[PDB]
From a paper:
Using Cx36-BRIL, we determined the high-resolution cryo-EM structure of Cx36 GJC solubilized in LMNG (hereafter referred to as Cx36LMNG-BRIL) with D6 symmetry at 2.2 Å. The cryo-EM structure revealed a dodecameric architecture of Cx36 subunits with overall dimensions of 90 Å × 90 Å × 140 Å. The two hemichannels docked with each other through intermolecular interaction of ECLs, and water molecules were highly concentrated at the boundary between the TM helices and the ECLs (middle, red spheres). However, similar to available Cx26 and Cx46/50 GJC structures, the solvent tunnel was closed in Cx36 GJC by the interactions of Glu49, Arg77, Arg246, and Glu249 residues. Indeed, we observed substantial densities presumed to be CHS molecules (two CHS molecules per protomer) and acyl chains of LMNG or cellular lipids, which sufficiently covered the cylindrical hydrophobic surface of the pores. We also investigated the Cx36LMNG-BRIL structure and confirmed that the double layers of pore-occluding densities are consistent in the detergent environment. When we examined the inner surface of the channel pore of Cx36LMNG-BRIL GJC, strong map densities were observed for the acyl chains of LMNG, but not the head group, and for the sterol ring of CHS, but not the succinyl group.
Cx36 is mainly expressed in neurons and forms the major component of GJCs in electrical synapses, playing important roles in cognitive functions, including memory consolidation and epileptogenesis. Here, we determine cryo-electron microscopy structures of Cx36 GJC at 2.2–3.6 Å resolutions, revealing a dynamic equilibrium between its closed and open states.
Author numbering:
A (entry chain C), B (entry chain D), C (entry chain E), D (entry chain B), E (entry chain F), F (entry chain A), ...: 19 to 101, 194 to 276
The structure:
């Protein structure tokens, strides 16, 4: 039971990297160029896009992926110099668990579970409240849900091993 | 008869990967930029494109290709650690069969066998029903039919071997 | 006489791959963006481009190149497993000959020997018949003629060897 | 305590390179194309963009990264020829410390800690003072703060080792 | 004297390949998008660009480079199978000489020694004669002259060796 | 003193190549698309851009970099065949010195030390004199000054070694 | 009672003529120029204006005014020639009564009692049903109601005198 | 019976003059400004308007009205000089009859009984056949029918008197 | 005191007629053509102009002027037929007083004492509330105040005479 | 025979005045606003309209009409002062004859007998020769022919009387 | 001396009326349509025109002309009823003097002696201060100066007569 | 000889009034709307039209006509009061002569003898010198020459009579 867990953790990590690297840069390419508002005022589209989408999903996901692979690099650099290893193993396991839970919680608090098609804006230089329209909302919602599911799997597996050793 | 089946399965898989990777990203590049509707209302083109094309074909095909190669990676990671293999072989064969049938069925239910040149839309902010026009419909239909045929071949071959061992 | 034929066949194949891979993606890049019709009707440019150019030349050529290299991959996979070879050699030679003749015949029936500068269109939503204008017609005609010549050479050489063994 | 410092310095350097190389070229891609001013005068957008953003962040960061890796290349070229090493080690450590402090100080004096959404311009050919509007200000502020933090960590670590040897 | 000639021929060939591959694709990128004519007639820009620039320089140069390297590939494939070589050497030298002289002569007859800034057009659908304007003419003339000079050097060197053996 | 000079020459050369290759292609990408003149005359923007910027900086720098590495390739090809070397060393040193001084002098005579924001034009089809406006002038001036400084360093170092041997 | 009726009839007639002649030509001046529909189809505004407003109010009112003054002109021309008058008086009274009742009934059946601000159209070349927008609807409704009231007064008065003589 | 005929002829003539003079100049005011065709070709609207409407209705009606009042002016000028009258009366009656029949016949042959909403055009510079759209067709048809009816009445009355005297 | 009152009443009436007739038609000529709102929605300008200005000032003033002159016309028609006059004088005086007070009260309730430069609109098809801008507001306010003053003078004078006779 | 000639001359003169005064100002109203040329050059429409139509027909006709009525005014002013008349009669007859022949000859030499629909122009600032398009050509030709006919009648009649007295 | 003064006063009054009535309505016709500001903000042209030109010159002049003719109408109405005249003459002279001095003083305080070509504006919705441009400034200044001169003459003459009687 | 001079003076005056009143208002109607300059700068068309045409011809001619009829009005008002006349006759003759010579001299100094088709402008806000284009130049030159000729005739005639009396 603890034997297969490692194998699947390695497989889940690689699957996630491949999905982000190959297709996600091209779902988000037209995000601001196809964002449009009903107005004749210069500068309102810029302000409303910035308030609706402060950090794009794809940037957050690349950052998370890189930061959850840092403990391994540290351990690798140490072992290369070596040429108390078990204590290092323990500590890096602890750190990886913490980092992945933090990133999942932050995703829920920043973005939620859906991307709507309409947005209501009241930022200067817009006069009163205006209505704006988003590009490709259904595809972006599907990507969000898939990523939450994969990261949950990873959290479960790492807790499994943490509680297995104790 | 069971000897050549493996050889051709390997060849079919590689052929499919090459076709998707080299040309498909560039048939679909202008999908929304050349989609147009007869209207003066801001935001109708966005809503109508999202309702006509919820998930693009090329995204679905990349995802399917990656997911049908996961059992092999698991088996490979196990065997590398090894340095009951036959039971693992049996189980992974079962899983691959199931995954490919699911993906083919889903394709039929999501997209059908053709891409029409006209689309009729009734989503807010469009006033009543409007008519919209698609880019490159004949080429997209040809790609759809070819992909269904290749995946059918793969399903047949894997069932062949499953029933051969029994 | 049969000695040099193999050497030149290998050279012809590589030459064709290089020409298609390095320059052809950029002759065809502006095909629809620089296609224009004399009209004020929304959707006519889309319909007329699709009827004039159903499958682009570059897509057809990539597909042909990949499909004529499949018998070699099958033979290679077999020989790797081996670690009646001559019968396999015979059969794959037969198949390659057939495939290349089919592709050349199809090219002649789909495209002909020239690309004209004007096109006459009568598809809905266009009112009666309209006149449209093509991008880079002379360069596209030159590419067509060159490709027919190379494929003819390959057909001749493979028949040479087929009749040599008998 | 001095053992782990080297390991983490190597890890920090690699992390910074990866973040700059993979995502930063695409946050800044639309910087001038989505910069807009309220005016009908030809040439004002150009003058105001140049005065607001003299050197782009991404250019400065690439330059800094390359220049802080020069002492290592010199030491490497010397040691390759060798096939007083400790004196060379001392001097290159001194130089790296100096270079990183200079670059951090310059960042603070050139850019500060935020990117505002509005800009006020009074350069010819603009008539009196005009108001202009920036693209993606919140994301650019986040990137600035992250980079200052990483470079601070590196400064601390290198001073640690400098004072350790003495 | 015959010793250094081979060394410099190899160097000239590599220099030419590098210049064409690294920069030439980006001098010619805006050739049709920045070509403009004084007219209100739909389709005249297309017809006039095609008549002024039938085959672009960069396409001709890539083709020439690939075709002058074919005799070497044939000789290489033969020698690999070998594992009358001197006769093959003689014949391939003859062929290379002929091919390079043909390509230089064709360049002179197709393009000349300059690219003008204005062009005068009388092709349907243009009414009578119209005036059109070219992008980046001085840079294109400089590239033309440089390429003629390099190819001349290569012709001289290969004739040198041909007459040396006799 | 002559020992370190070689090490630093190698380091300077590599630094220059990296700066040109990684960032310079993207400072100059919008050079003509963001060049604008105050006029209603077709063709004036084209003529004025060509007269203001005959050869772009980035093209000149790529060419210089490639040409200053040619003596090394010749020497390398000779030594490979070898498997009076010192005479070849002497001559190639002489040639490299000459080439780098020529390129620096030409830079000063072609471009100077600054790029202005305004340009005054009197070329046909422009009526009398018109005023035009440049993109990103401050960044381009900074790049110019940096490149002059690096090439000066290289000139000094090579003269050092030339006078050292004598 | 019959004495004042004639005086007021003369006054009502003159009041109506003055109102139509002085102001009504300028309420209706922008009727088609400010009529607008949500569409990109050429010719839909024309078809929809013609179907919504077949005969303009002001034309109908001018025609009615002229036709109800014809019996008087006939009687006047007769009496001028005279230089059974009572029989002519009787007959012309009968005719005037009939004409004014017909015109009032026709007004009710053609136009009703209000002019709405929105109009729904389904005439060729419009695709399906479209929405259009009217100019100055409230003012036009007020004018309609006033005119119905005045004509009713006139009908009552003329019947009064008809029944008075008997 | 012949007594009233003169009275009504005078009344019919005056009624016709009033209708043409007061309202008809403003039904036809936007005839060419609101005529539109589906095309991008300069000059097609002009050619198609001229072919659809060679002489406007209002011009023809003004001309007819003036020419049918010429015999009276001649008779008046004669009688003023007088200060065989019956012979002049006879001849002028004959001439008036002839003129009014000619004008009615010409109206039928030039215009017919309706004005359609669509027009089909094939005149240079239009490419093949194009579709054009007319302004206010229903109102123009109503005016046509009314004018034919009035002129018929006048013809009948004048023949009445001609046959009465004999 | 009662002698001059009649003289001034006649003078006030004539002054008012002249001011309305000569200049007011040209202050109001561009009322809707220069009314503008900040929106991209078709039909909002029409709806907002109709809600802000239901009946134009100039129409109301022409109507009032005509209706306050009706009692005089009735009295005149009676006296012409005459060829109890004092009772008719009494009654018409009463009616004129009433009519002028009603019109002044209505002006105050319909329009007030000022015309603002901004207007806030929330009528369909406008999305939420929009801001619109008026033409020539200061001149229109001046005209309003002047007209209220003149009508007040007339009211005072007519009451004077009414109370004088008693 | 000489009796009726005077009567008809008076009638012809009045007919001509009425036709010019009532309708001709409105055939020519859009002469320059609907004149269009195929070009993008500023100022070409102005130059080409001025060269095609130097003096408009309607101006020439008004001038002619006024100048042919001058002898009568002189005679009238003389006779009014009188309160050798026959000599004045003779001289004024001579002058009127001469003036009308001159004006008819000038019409033929200035305008001819038709107005074409196309015009070919080669005036600065137009580049080479351009094609332009005229408004309402058929109606203008009809007006020309009618006016020539009327003036011919007048010439004949005045010569009649001149030769009658002798 | 007092005899001619009356004659010239009558002549001056008539001259002024003719100049205002015949030409001034057409100098001012394009006042707002040719007023333009350098801005992209909706509503700024309206606000700036209203602040620069609160009451147009031509309106003020018509009003003044009508108000200075009121004393004469009162005197005329009195004298007509008459069918102490000298006292009425005295009083009306006093009133006319006062009215004309008031109007001249007001002109100086409202408009001054010139109309400039540029105007500087800072009214909402304009962002900060903007520059605007006026139509026909020189002609408007000439009209202003002429009108001041004429009114001064009238003031002088009326004071002359006032002091003459005493 | 002095008898006819008066008759012709009266005729010349009336002819001039008729020509100015009937046609000149419509040659000049599009003077600024069809004036165009080659520029993208806001406000340059306004400044250049004002500098090229400070006072329009038609305004100057109306003013001159009114001012040369003032002496007659004075004489008429005097003679009406009369109900030394010869002295008044003498003085008014003197004044008329002077006024007409002044107006002719001023015309020559203000306008000359031609109106050119091109105009060269250097007024702010135009950048350096720009080229502008005039409407209807040939017709305006013809009108100028005709008016100079008529006024010369009048000058000659009035001097004739002045010298006749002496
Ligand atoms: C390709 C990028 C080049 C990166 C280097 C930056 C060069 C500075 C550019 C000048 C801005 C031009 C004026 C623009 C507009 C302008 O108004 O300037 C902005 C501001 C005033 O200037 C400063 O505050 C610059 C001071 C910081 C100086 C930066 C130094 C950073 C380099 C230090 C790296 C080595 C330190 C080690 C020493 C041992």
């Amino acid at each position: 039971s603890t034997m297969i867990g490692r194998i699947l953790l390695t497989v889940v990590v690689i699957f996630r990297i491949l999905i982000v690297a190959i297709v996600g840069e091209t779902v988000y390419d037209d995000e601001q160029t196809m964002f449009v508002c009903n107005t004749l005022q210069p500068g309102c589209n810029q302000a409303c896009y910035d308030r609706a989408f402060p950090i794009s999903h794809i940037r957050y996901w690349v950052f998370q992926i890189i930061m959850v692979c840092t403990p391994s690099l540290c351990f690798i650099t140490y072992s290369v110099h070596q040429s108390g290893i078990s204590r290092f193993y323990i500590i890096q396991v602890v750190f990886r668990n913490a980092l992945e839970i933090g990133f999942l919680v932050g995703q829920y608090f920043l973005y939620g579970f859906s991307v709507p098609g309409l947005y209501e804006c009241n930022r200067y230089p817009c006069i009163k409240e205006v209505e704006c329209y988003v590009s490709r909302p259904t595809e972006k919602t599907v990507f969000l849900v898939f990523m939450f599911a994969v990261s949950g799997i990873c959290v479960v597996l790492n807790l499994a091993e943490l509680n297995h050793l104790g």
